[PDB]
Amino acid sequence: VASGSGEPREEAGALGPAWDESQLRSYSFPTRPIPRLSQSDPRAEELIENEEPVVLTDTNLVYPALKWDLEYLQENIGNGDFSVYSASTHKFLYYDEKKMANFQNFKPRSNREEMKFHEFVEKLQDIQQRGGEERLYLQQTLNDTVGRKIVMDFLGFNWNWINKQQGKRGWGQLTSNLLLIGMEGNVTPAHYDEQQNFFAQIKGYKRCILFPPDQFECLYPYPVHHPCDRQSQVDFDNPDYERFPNFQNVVGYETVVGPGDVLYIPMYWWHHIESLLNGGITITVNFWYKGAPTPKRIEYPLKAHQKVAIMRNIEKMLGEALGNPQEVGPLLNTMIKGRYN
Numbered sequence: 001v002a003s004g005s006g007e008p009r010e011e012a013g014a015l016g017p018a019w020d021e022s023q024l025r026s027y028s029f030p031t032r033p034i035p036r037l038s039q040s041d042p043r044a045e046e047l048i049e050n051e052e053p054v055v056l057t058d059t060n061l062v063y064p065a066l067k068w069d070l071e072y073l074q075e076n077i078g079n080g081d082f083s084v085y086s087a088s089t090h091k092f093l094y095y096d097e098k099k100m101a102n103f104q105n106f107k108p109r110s111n112r113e114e115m116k117f118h119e120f121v122e123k124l125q126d127i128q129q130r131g132g133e134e135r136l137y138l139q140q141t142l143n144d145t146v147g148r149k150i151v152m153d154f155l156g157f158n159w160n161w162i163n164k165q166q167g168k169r170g171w172g173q174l175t176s177n178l179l180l181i182g183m184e185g186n187v188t189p190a191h192y193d194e195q196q197n198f199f200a201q202i203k204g205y206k207r208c209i210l211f212p213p214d215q216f217e218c219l220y221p222y223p224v225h226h227p228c229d230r231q232s233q234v235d236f237d238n239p240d241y242e243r244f245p246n247f248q249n250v251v252g253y254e255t256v257v258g259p260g261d262v263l264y265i266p267m268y269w270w271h272h273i274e275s276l277l278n279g280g281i282t283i284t285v286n287f288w289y290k291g292a293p294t295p296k297r298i299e300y301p302l303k304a305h306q307k308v309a310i311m312r313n314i315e316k317m318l319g320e321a322l323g324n325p326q327e328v329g330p331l332l333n334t335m336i337k338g339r340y341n
């Protein structure tokens with residue numbers, strides 16, 4: 001019952017439907033729509049305050065970036081080195097390189113490669129000509145090495161609105177802005193992040209499927225010390241119900257964001273992102289903020305994301321107390337077998 005994005009929106013000027021369901025991939029779980037609201041709507045304000053997702057339609061957060069395409073960026077983004085991830089499949093499973101030492105019998109299926117922006121544009125054009133099925137994804141934090149016109153657009157962002165959001169929520173500093181340029185059909189598999197995220201869509205359309213933190217049991221993340229920490233072990237395209245039985249109980253929140261839309265992805269919320277099939281390249285800029293500090297007085301019962309934080313810290317402490325992350329598993333099983341299960 002994954003009819004969660006509602007009926008496709010009609011573009012202004014009678015330009016037809018922005019998308020159709022044939023461009024969405026099919027999955028085994030039901031979803032329900034994420035609310036699409038105006039930033040002036042108080043309902044959207046209490047959704048963000050209570051850490052629930054919402055699509056804001058009229059923030060003008062990245063208004064100067066809506067003119068961006070591959071040509072404009074190649075001319076103005078500068079000559080810095082851009083992280084580009086390759087893959088032979090539509091799923092871009094990212095991995096922590098610093099944690100690759102803990103798991104030697106782990107081979108990554110999507111390698112990173114730095115390059116110039118013109119090399120990335122060229123590498124895309126070869127694949128389209130060659131008819132190849134290799135897929136690329138540019139994920140690069142913007143810094144000071146960008147050209148003059150790009151800094152013009154960056155300064156043109158609606159900092160008034162997003163800084164006021166940072167203050168009202170007690171969030172920490174803006175950690176980074178990640179520029180995402182992906183091919184059609186590209187998929188970022190389900191994972192969660194430990195920061196608050198404003199997902200500002202620029203070019204193309206992306207389907208975003210979100211799961212609240214209380215569905216930890218249904219999504220089976222890798223061990224904290226695994227390179228794929230915070231990512232789900234479940235193959236959404238071929239779910240192993242024997243290893244992951246509670247994935248049969250997972251329920252999602254779904255929406256399709258287009259140019260001008262801003263999706264609030266609350267901290268610790270799972271998200272599965274896919275660029276719509278046959279929808280052209282996609283461009284996104286997201287804004288990451290450190291969450292509000294833990295309050296002095298602890299209120300019980302704990303929120304679901306607090307229990308996830310407790311589980312992460314236990315795995316972390318266990319890994320350094322034993323001197324080897326590989327012993328975390330056997331000791332945890334020893335602790336519960338015949339005692340808590």
Ligand SMILES: O=C(O)CNC(=O)c1ncc(-c2cc(-c3cccc(Cl)c3)no2)cc1O
Nearest residue numbers: 094095096097098180188193206271273284
């Ligand atoms: O595709 C879309 O539109 C949506 N993209 C996302 O949601 C998204 N979010 C967060 C991250 C991320 C990856 C890491 C990281 C990876 C490997 C090693 C190390 Cl050290 C750090 N940190 O953050 C990547 C993402 O793709």
Ligand SMILES: [Zn+2]
Nearest residue numbers: 191192193271
């Ligand atoms: Zn993420």
